[PDB]
Amino acid sequence: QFNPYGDNGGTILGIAGEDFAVLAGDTRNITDYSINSRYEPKVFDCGDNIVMSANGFAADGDALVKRFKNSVKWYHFDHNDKKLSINSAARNIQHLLYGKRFFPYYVHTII
Amino acid sequence: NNYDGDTVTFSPTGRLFQVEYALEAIKQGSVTVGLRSNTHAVLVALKRNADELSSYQKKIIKCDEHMGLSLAGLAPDARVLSNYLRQQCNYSSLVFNRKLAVERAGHLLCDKAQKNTQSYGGRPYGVGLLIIGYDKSGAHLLEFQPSGNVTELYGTAIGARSQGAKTYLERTLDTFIKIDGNPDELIKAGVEAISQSLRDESLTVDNLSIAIVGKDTPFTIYDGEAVAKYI
Amino acid sequence: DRGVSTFSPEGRLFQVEYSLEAIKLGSTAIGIATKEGVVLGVEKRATSPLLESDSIEKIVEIDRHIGCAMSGLTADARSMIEHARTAAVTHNLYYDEDINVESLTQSVCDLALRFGELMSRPFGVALLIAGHDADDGYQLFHAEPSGTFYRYNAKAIGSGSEGAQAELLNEWHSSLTLKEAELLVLKILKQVMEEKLDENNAQLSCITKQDGFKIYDNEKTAELIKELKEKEAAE
Amino acid sequence: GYDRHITIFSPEGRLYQVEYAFKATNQTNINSLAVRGKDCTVVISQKKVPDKLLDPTTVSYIFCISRTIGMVVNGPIPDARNAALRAKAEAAEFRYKYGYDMPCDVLAKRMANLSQIYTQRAYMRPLGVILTFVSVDEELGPSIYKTDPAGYYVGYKATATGPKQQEITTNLENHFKKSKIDHINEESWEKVVEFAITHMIDALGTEFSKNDLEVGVATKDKFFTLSAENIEERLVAIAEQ
Amino acid sequence: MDIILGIRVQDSVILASSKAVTRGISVLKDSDDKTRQLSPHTLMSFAGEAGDTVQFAEYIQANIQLYSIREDYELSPQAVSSFVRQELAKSIRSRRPYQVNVLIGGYDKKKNKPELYQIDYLGTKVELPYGAHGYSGFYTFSLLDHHYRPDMTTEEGLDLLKLCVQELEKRMPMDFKGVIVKIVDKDGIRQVDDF
Amino acid sequence: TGYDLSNSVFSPDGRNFQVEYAVKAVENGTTSIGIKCNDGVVFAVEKLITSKLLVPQKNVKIQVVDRHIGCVYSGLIPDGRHLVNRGREEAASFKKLYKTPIPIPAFADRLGQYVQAHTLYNSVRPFGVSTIFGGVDKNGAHLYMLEPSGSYWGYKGAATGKGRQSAKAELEKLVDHHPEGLSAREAVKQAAKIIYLAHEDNKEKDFELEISWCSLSETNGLHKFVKGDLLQEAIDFAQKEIN
Amino acid sequence: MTDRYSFSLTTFSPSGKLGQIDYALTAVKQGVTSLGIKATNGVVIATEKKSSSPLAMSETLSKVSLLTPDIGAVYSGMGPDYRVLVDKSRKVAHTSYKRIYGEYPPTKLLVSEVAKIMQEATQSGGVRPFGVSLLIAGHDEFNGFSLYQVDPSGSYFPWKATAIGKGSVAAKTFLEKRWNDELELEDAIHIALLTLKESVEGEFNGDTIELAIIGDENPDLLGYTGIPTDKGPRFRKLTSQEINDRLEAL
Amino acid sequence: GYDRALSIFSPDGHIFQVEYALEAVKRGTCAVGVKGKNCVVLGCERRSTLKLQDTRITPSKVSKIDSHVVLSFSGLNADSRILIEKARVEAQSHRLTLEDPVTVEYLTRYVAGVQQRYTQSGGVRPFGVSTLIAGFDPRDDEPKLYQTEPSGIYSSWSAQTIGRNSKTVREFLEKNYDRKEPPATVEECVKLTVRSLLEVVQTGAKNIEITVVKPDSDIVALSSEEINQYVTQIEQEKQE
Amino acid sequence: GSRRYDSRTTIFSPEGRLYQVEYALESISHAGTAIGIMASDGIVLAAERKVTSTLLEQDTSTEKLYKLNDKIAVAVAGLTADAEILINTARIHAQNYLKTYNEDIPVEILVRRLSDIKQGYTQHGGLRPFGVSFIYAGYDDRYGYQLYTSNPSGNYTGWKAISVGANTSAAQTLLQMDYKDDMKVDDAIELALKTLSKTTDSSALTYDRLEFATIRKGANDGEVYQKIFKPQEIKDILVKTGIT
């Protein structure tokens, strides 16, 4: 039977300082015991000073990042180029994720 | 006369009066000018207020990083049509990783407006649009009319008294077409063009709207104190 | 007849122009924006003395930071208010923030031209939408059934509007206090109203950043009416 | 007078839109004729190519509906082709559903039913065409069945349609009064075609070259149309007589 | 849920329904009232699947109340029980069936008679002198078969019910936390507060 | 009367006046033509230069369908685009099911039925274009012209728009003088000449010429635009002939 | 595209008439005379086969139609409308009855279904009424023989005998003088032929007259044997020859 | 589906189909509501060209929406049944979700919403009905009286009348109703209600209906005799 | 589009009347009169057929009086085909109720639903209304014997005695004169026939131009019987009251 999920490995890490924040991740992409790529970035600048990583099943990760980036674009269009605050981004991502509650994105998301 | 009750009816001489009346709404609209060189494309718009207590109606709308437009006529129809363009540009990026060619944008608007001219119940769009953009074949200016006719030009103008700006741009063609790698000079030529359509009113700071897109310039809009440089 | 979405030979939509005539028959509503807040006032205009005037609801809350006044076929406004309230609350759910006043007004105005042969006719009511947000501060908007909305420093709508607007053109300046705005709404309402303005046939409200949107009691407004009469007798 | 614009009854119980669709039938100014042999069914129609720029091979009002059924139309070509495409689709569907070839008369009834619907339903206009269906049916033999904008249809011994239809009809009537039989008593379809052309000439009082006519022939298991040369061959035999 | 019983006597119907609400290894509530008044002289008790029970009971209640207002009239206990049966009969072939068993105790004012209907989740209706749902019947039916008489007073009915609860409290494995008892007669519906 | 106020209504003489009114819009449009040749077809159209501000070469009117069919039309331009968009859908579904690219007669009827369908109801307007189209298939070259009524035929040459009479007269001379056939390269030249000759009937505004062709030998049976040296050569031949 | 005619085309006028129904009845009036006569042991329905051209084969155009083995129909008015009503009537006899009860509908109920179809063309959106009046003759076990008239409005009436169309007024008067409750089937056929001759202009024979009967079961028309309870259709169309036989003893 | 915009604006800014629906209300029998200190009374005219009426079964002019709220109307009777049914359904739905019966204001707002919706939906005409909605909010003793009309506007009234000759009885109520002192008893409130109908009705025989609503779901209709007692008493004090 | 041909069947006149309802009522005023009279021990339905021909089969005929269930019947005035559409709907509705509650449908509930269907055609859909007025005669254990009427507007009312169709003005005046409350069924029968006899547009009232029915408790103890009169029975009762 077709299994629509996979595991692309990798690990990510976010730490917040007083006036800064880092979001790190390795660049190795795998399936089973093979390496797909030694350099495939999974941490992205999404605009408005927000960095994002959705780690786990890469196809779902890319889809979510793509959808969120698009959400930032439309937020500008719909609210007079207003900057999307990090707390507002977080709530927006909740709805992106929960919208597929019964067929989830297989990712640990950090922004 | 008897043939203007709806868009689906031809007159005996082959005219579509509802489309022509839609065209009339554009003529009552405030003047807006478009022009381009080989490196940049510029929109200039005269904004209109309701009275001295009101804001000035926005005329220019951004569609993508590399494309945008100005409007004359029914503003809500421009909102509908610009939104469609935003989606089409967006689809092109997400699915093909490709910026939408200004020419295709023109074809898409033409076909969308056309459908409203051949079926019962609808109405034609009541707005004219000037689309500028910079894509893989350089700078572009398009003129959209709600009849569905889209036309690629070096420069043009639509709205009330637009004839003056259009004549001026026709005269100045050989000069402004070669204002390459100089944004401020292309805008100044556009500001001079729109001035040929003024009457008992002059360009002020909350009156004038300018947009520019080009080789190394994303579509950006200039308003308020940021256009004082050009008055 | 002839299509509901038809253009006139002058390039205007018949039905939108006709709905504008119905708004002219509506009771007067006035809004004044200041740097201390926005004041919204209305003429209640009860059709009979037996009608209990406190049940006339022409000033309405959309969210804590946005209020609304209406003029024309006021029953048409209910679904517009319902959309506005849902738009405002929905935005907060999706974004954990307050929704901008302009975005609210644009959302309400998106309903306007959704008629034809979608609803069967345009709305027969104009709205004054007043609110505050952190980006653009205190704002007043005039939402029409054409789908157009203008931002205003001050605006009057309804039967007494063109006389009231000329009055607002002279009186409005960028340094008005909230108290000055309250008195000014009362003053211009008494001018254009048919009957004698009192605390029962006219209503006041405001929106401030601190306390949000508030409708005034009849006691509170009554004192401002007395205060206005005293200032005008005093020269 | 909106009773004249759509298919509702007038005060005297008429359908003017149906009547006006009949007048559209003659708009091409073409006359057609159909007769039956012992073995075959022949249909001939006038071919007028007025413009010198036309490709004359594409000017046709005869259609091969199925392998066994042919159809000639009297009326404007857009409506004619509308009816032709539908008849083809119907004939093909019938064969798939029921396992045998659609009979000429059954297709005629089906198209007549569709036409009837346009006379009762307001949103569909009648087609401005008269459709003459021909075949050599495996049960009924040589067959002519004709359909009109009223949704009427009937079988014929022979028939004619067009502006000068009455002249041709009485011509054919008089021949069968003489002959005493239901058909052209001839073995070869070639001679039945010759009869058809001869009686069209007499009735219309005009001579034909090979490009002034168009001929369709139905035999057992196939309907086919003739080329200009097959028709020329036929005109020659008529002259040498 | 679990224990719901019913006894029709001479002039009344008596419903006894357990008070416990248990989820997992915890008794979450010991005063739950597993009943809804459908009309002034009609009472319905219920047991079954969590959520389903109350949702169904209230849906029936709303419908009977709507009917009463529309017609300014009280539907007979027979008529109400037929409506309820049909709703359950519809439900058993839907995408997700209501897993609810009910007892309907009513006093027919036109006939001057108490009436007890037992309806299971499949829509199996039966009029009885006494009824039960689930495992309750396995203990009470034989006891009722022995001691029940059709001319019993309300008092005698309650004593007979006491005997049933005592037997259940002795032999049933689970602690159902006693019962709430309600009487349906010509004067309406009242609750016995000491059982 | 009032028979002309609603599409699909028969007048007492059996006419659909709304289609006839659509024809008037076509007669008002610019001149377009088609010439059928030895092994292909050639299309050309008059593009009125309304102003100096129009970018030359950049408001392309001739349209390709699939890879082997060219389409040009006169009248309401957006209506023509709508028709081609449909034609492209029709060609795609034909190739999808049957593999082979749609033959020209088959494609001709796809447009025909669609245009005819817009004469059947009062809720749609007829097409305000006459469309000249064609190409090369497995049976050689075909040229077609389609009117607002849905009527179409095969043609040796075709013309529509304001200069249709002038163009038709010129087309007839070529047909008379070349019974054996015109070559693809000669047809391009003649198309240029005819558009120039047809421009007399529209002589206020000056114009821009546009030409395309499908030829089995010259374009390998694919639709291509005539540009550069071959186009200038054709423009020169045309200038040489009006003088 | 698609039907924008979702509104009625038949409406009440100020005087209370339903115009389109009246006008449909006028079309029926122009129609060729057809009639029905009920005997004690059968029913006869008859009409003139008004031929359009002598080149037409009038046998291919059948005005008298079998609906069920025991029910037949004839009409006056618009032929194409009748033809599709027969198609629908035949089908509804199956879908709304035979596929449910395993037997054919009784005459009154099939008539009721046709009447319903015709009524809906009087009220539904974007249609005109049917321009026909029907005469339906049938037999069923529990009602015996019956004859019904169905008009454009959808109204239907049971008759002993009646006529519709062109010369219906004269024909009804002729039938009033001749009808009694003792008529045997052969007597009714004779009266039907007499009545029709008054309204027929040209030739009067078995090729210009169409006539069918509802009478005894015809086992020779069943097509099979072996089931005693299946005895054959009660509907029979008289042949051209059988009509001419009765026209010599006229 | 049928689609026509039947309710549209005319050049002067009127919606004629809404305004013509008001004419239908003007033709309907008179209805009046008067609220006292502790009750609301609804009085209704019944036209007297109808003898041989069976009053046991003939639809009453006052309808219970719930056990605590009532609705009367003027205009098309058939139209009112649709509004009454929808109101009754919503009343039960409110009890089901909120676990509290509707307030009188809420129920009125719902009915008014239905009416308004029928003035800007395609393929429908407006309700030819105006309503008087009266009762007491749950656990509240302040009387409530509201009016709705075909446009969808609604408001609260101390006393109000609708239907034919309502301008005459509004006249009466305006000069006979003291806002400062509402009818302090049921007795007084029924009397003022009957007086106002006697300005317009005729002989108050089988012509007048009265329904009295008190707090906590206490609704009752008066019989002819009880009403006739008021009629008799009113006419005796009249001779002056 | 098709707007041109739309009558707008569901609009108000400037006077606030529904055109089509008024015109449907005008249509019904030309239909054969039908009378219903309610007595203490039953109900009478009597109706005049539309100008009958001598060749019409009277015994297998139904035009005016129809059975909805065993306890309820209707008399029809208007287009018969329109009435049959509504009658079949009413019959189904009665069975739905019986299936749901295991009790026969109360008369008013059936009447309200039919009347609501009529109302719908006057407010939405753009279709012509049903050109029918009904007289409902029925019995249930709540109100006993009941008479109702409904018309194309979907308005319905209860009656002691009522007429629909032609000459209702004259017919109602006569019923108002001679009707009294204590009246028995056999008196009501006589009143019904004598009223039609005086208001009819025919020269003389005969058995072949009448349909007749009674609903009595005339079977066996607390059970109700519907009697749709046969032609011979109508002929007898016509003689028994001295009209023939």
Swiss-Prot record, chain A:
Which protein is depicted? Proteasome subunit beta type-6
Q: Tell me the part of the parent protein that is shown.
A: 20 to 130 of 241
Give its localization: Cytoplasm; Nucleus
On the tree of life, the source organism's domain of life is Eukaryota
Q: Which organism is it from?
A: Saccharomyces cerevisiae (strain ATCC 204508 / S288c)
The role this protein plays is: Non-catalytic component of the proteasome which degrades poly-ubiquitinated proteins in the cytoplasm and in the nucleus. It is essential for the regulated turnover of proteins and for the removal of misfolded proteins. The proteasome is a multicatalytic proteinase complex that is characterized by its ability to cleave peptides with Arg, Phe, Tyr, Leu, and Glu adjacent to the leaving group at neutral or slightly basic pH. It has an ATP-dependent proteolytic activity.
Q: What's the subunit arrangement here?
A: The 26S proteasome consists of a 20S proteasome core and two 19S regulatory subunits. The 20S proteasome core is composed of 28 subunits that are arranged in four stacked rings, resulting in a barrel-shaped structure. The two end rings are each formed by seven alpha subunits, and the two central rings are each formed by seven beta subunits. The catalytic chamber with the active sites is on the inside of the barrel.
Family to which this protein belongs: Belongs to the peptidase T1B family.
Q: Which residues form a coiled coil?
A: none
From Swiss-Prot, chain C:
SUPFAM superfamilies xref list: N-terminal nucleophile aminohydrolases (Ntn hydrolases)
The record's note on quaternary structure and interaction partners says: The 26S proteasome consists of a 20S proteasome core and two 19S regulatory subunits. The 20S proteasome core is composed of 28 subunits that are arranged in four stacked rings, resulting in a barrel-shaped structure. The two end rings are each formed by seven alpha subunits, and the two central rings are each formed by seven beta subunits. The catalytic chamber with the active sites is on the inside of the barrel.
Q: Has keyword Zinc? A: no
Q: Would you tell me the protein name for this molecule?
A: Proteasome subunit alpha type-5
Where does it localize?
Cytoplasm; Nucleus
Q: Entry's SMART domains?
A: Proteasome_A_N
Report the main location listed first in the record.
Answer: cytoplasm
Does Repeat count among this protein's keywords?
Answer: no
Q: Which family does it belong to?
A: Belongs to the peptidase T1A family.
Functionally, this protein is described as follows: The proteasome degrades poly-ubiquitinated proteins in the cytoplasm and in the nucleus. It is essential for the regulated turnover of proteins and for the removal of misfolded proteins. The proteasome is a multicatalytic proteinase complex that is characterized by its ability to cleave peptides with Arg, Phe, Tyr, Leu, and Glu adjacent to the leaving group at neutral or slightly basic pH. It has an ATP-dependent proteolytic activity.
Q: Which residues carry this modification: Phosphoserine?
A: S48
Q: Name one GO biological process term.
A: proteasome-mediated ubiquitin-dependent protein catabolic process
Q: Which InterPro entries match?
A: Ntn_hydrolases_N, Proteasome_alpha, Proteasome_alpha-type, Proteasome_alpha_type_5, Proteasome_asu_N, Proteasome_sua/b
Q: Which residues form the signal peptide?
A: none
User: Pfam families from the entry?
Assistant: Proteasome, Proteasome_A_N
Q: Which residues carry this modification: Phosphothreonine?
A: T47
Swiss-Prot record, chain D:
Cross-link Glycyl lysine isopeptide (Lys-Gly) (interchain with G-Cter in ubiquitin) placement: K222
Q: Which domain of life is it from?
A: Eukaryota
Q: Which UniProt keywords apply?
A: Acetylation, Cytoplasm, Isopeptide bond, Nucleus, Phosphoprotein, Proteasome, Ubl conjugation
Q: Which PANTHER family match?
A: PROTEASOME SUBUNIT ALPHA/BETA
Please give the function described in this protein's UniProt entry: The proteasome degrades poly-ubiquitinated proteins in the cytoplasm and in the nucleus. It is essential for the regulated turnover of proteins and for the removal of misfolded proteins. The proteasome is a multicatalytic proteinase complex that is characterized by its ability to cleave peptides with Arg, Phe, Tyr, Leu, and Glu adjacent to the leaving group at neutral or slightly basic pH. It has an ATP-dependent proteolytic activity.
Q: How does it assemble?
A: The 26S proteasome consists of a 20S proteasome core and two 19S regulatory subunits. The 20S proteasome core is composed of 28 subunits that are arranged in four stacked rings, resulting in a barrel-shaped structure. The two end rings are each formed by seven alpha subunits, and the two central rings are each formed by seven beta subunits. The catalytic chamber with the active sites is on the inside of the barrel. Interacts with CIC1.
Concerning its family, UniProt says: Belongs to the peptidase T1A family.
Q: What is this protein called?
A: Proteasome subunit alpha type-1
What species is given as this protein's source?
A: Saccharomyces cerevisiae (strain ATCC 204508 / S288c)
From Swiss-Prot, chain H:
Q: Write out the GO biological process terms.
A: proteasomal ubiquitin-independent protein catabolic process; proteasome-mediated ubiquitin-dependent protein catabolic process
Q: Does the keyword Repeat apply?
A: no
PROSITE patterns with a match to the protein in the record: PROTEASOME_ALPHA_1, PROTEASOME_ALPHA_2
Kindly list the places in or outside the cell where this protein is found, as annotated in its UniProt entry.
Answer: Cytoplasm; Nucleus
Q: Name one GO cellular component term.
A: proteasome storage granule
Name the major location: cytoplasm
| Gene3D superfamilies found in the cross-reference section | Glutamine Phosphoribosylpyrophosphate, subunit 1, domain 1
Pfam families, per the entry: Proteasome, Proteasome_A_N
Q: Which residues carry this modification: Phosphothreonine?
A: T58
In the record, the note on similarity to other proteins reads: Belongs to the peptidase T1A family.
User: Which NCBIfam families does this chain map to?
Assistant: PRK03996.1
Q: What is this protein called?
A: Proteasome subunit alpha type-4
